[PDB]
């Protein structure tokens, strides 16, 4: 019954600002500290600050102080974290959390990407099977922004043996990923293998048939 429901994903340019919201329900909002914590995949979890709702005073991590503001509206039971002068290292998942001798309740998280890149759909290339009994094939999904892309095989009919890998961020600022499947060699040749790629920000939907040679 306690719920913390955050706003959706954001993509911002370096130097700009983002405001993430946290709507609390299931308890009296003005009775507990609400904190913000972020997680970037190479600085772990990092505490940002708190606010006691109904009271204008907030407390910040010195690492963020000078470019972070936490606010709360008791009327709407909503807290906010605004982070300014955004830099690429602020790319992270931002969480609100309710405090009691630790953080017993957490919001679902809000992904924020900081990049100067523009929205772009991917190019999809085959990873063709080579010339004992199993074969690997795949699709390379190159040069898209922002995340995510989804990949299926044979429109969801092929799930066994599939690995869709984490994307990598290239120096261009665009992402690339691969998806592979292993199948019986004998099948190269009675079965059709098609990778279906979907990138929603660009409404890119591509079906690539993957075959020998």
């Amino acid at each position: 019954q306690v719920q913390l429901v955050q706003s959706g994903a954001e993509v911002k340019k370096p130097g700009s600002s983002v405001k993430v919201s946290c709507k609390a329900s299931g308890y009296t909002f003005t009775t507990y500290y609400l904190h913000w914590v972020r997680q970037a995949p190479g600085q772990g979890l990092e505490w940002m600050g708190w606010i006691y709702p109904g009271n204008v005073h907030a407390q910040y991590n010195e690492k963020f102080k000078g470019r972070v503001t936490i606010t709360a509206d008791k009327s709407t039971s909503t807290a906010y974290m605004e982070l300014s002068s955004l830099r690429s290292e602020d790319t992270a998942v931002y969480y609100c959390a309710r405090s009691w001798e630790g953080f017993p309740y957490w919001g679902q998280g809000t992904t924020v990407t900081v990049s100067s890149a523009s929205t772009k759909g991917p190019s999809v290339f085959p990873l063709a099977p080579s010339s004992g009994g199993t074969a690997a094939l795949g699709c390379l999904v190159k040069d898209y922004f922002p995340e995510p892309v989804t990949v299926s095989w044979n429109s969801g009919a092929l799930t066994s043996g599939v690995h869709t890998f984490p994307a990598v961020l290239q120096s261009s600022g665009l992402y690339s990923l691969s998806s592979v499947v292993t199948v019986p060699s004998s099948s190269l040749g009675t079965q059709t293998y098609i990778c279906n790629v979907n990138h929603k920000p660009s409404n890119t939907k591509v079906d690539k048939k993957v075959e020998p040679k």
């Binding site: 904190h35 914590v37 772990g44 979890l45 990092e46 505490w47 407390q59 991590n61 010195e62 690492k63 969480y95 405090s99 009691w100 001798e101 630790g102 953080f103 017993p104 309740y105 957490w106 919001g107 679902q108 998280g109 190019s123 290339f125 085959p126 990873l127 063709a128 080579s130 199993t134 690997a136 795949g138 390379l140 190159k142 690995h163 890998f165 984490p166 994307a167 990598v168 290239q170 690339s176 990923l177 691969s178 592979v180 292993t182």
Partner: protein, 212 residues
Amino acid sequence: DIQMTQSPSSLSASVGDRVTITCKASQNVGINVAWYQQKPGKAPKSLISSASYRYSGVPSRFSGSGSGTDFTLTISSLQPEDFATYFCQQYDTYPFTFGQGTKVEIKRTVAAPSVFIFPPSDEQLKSGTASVVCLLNNFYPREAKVQWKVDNALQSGNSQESVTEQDSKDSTYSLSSTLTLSKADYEKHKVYACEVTHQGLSSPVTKSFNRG
């Protein structure tokens, strides 16, 4: 600020095992420490409060102990749902700070990767770039090394890789590496190879193709 250092950074275990994760605080933090569990893609879930108090609804197999600078999370008998990363946190003084996480992974028998190399497609080459891909499929443990060679020349700085999360059914990992070249560079060389090393391979495995 207070550094929270967890040991080990990772741990392999089986269902039924007793698992212990420790956390050393760089300064005294009393009993003002909490423990969390997090699974890939999900928010943390709280386990222990005030060093040793189990949050409401947390299974009895989770226990916490310690005070001052040394803290311990114990899982008495690991369950299928307990493979995850565990974090400690101090809330004694500001800034609140977290440990780096300890990953509890599923132990299995060692498995050498199956290695596959994929040349660039003809479609891509038109674009003026060549991506060569190396797949290391279904191996264990996670530690593997891929080296790219172009006409026997070890490559540096022109590849990227990523690794899947441990498979929930077979307990293996897979890794994909991409070597990126300009079409002009690609066309200047014949032999493209990835060389793989892994505990399960008594010597390195090389997969190669000749352009054309």
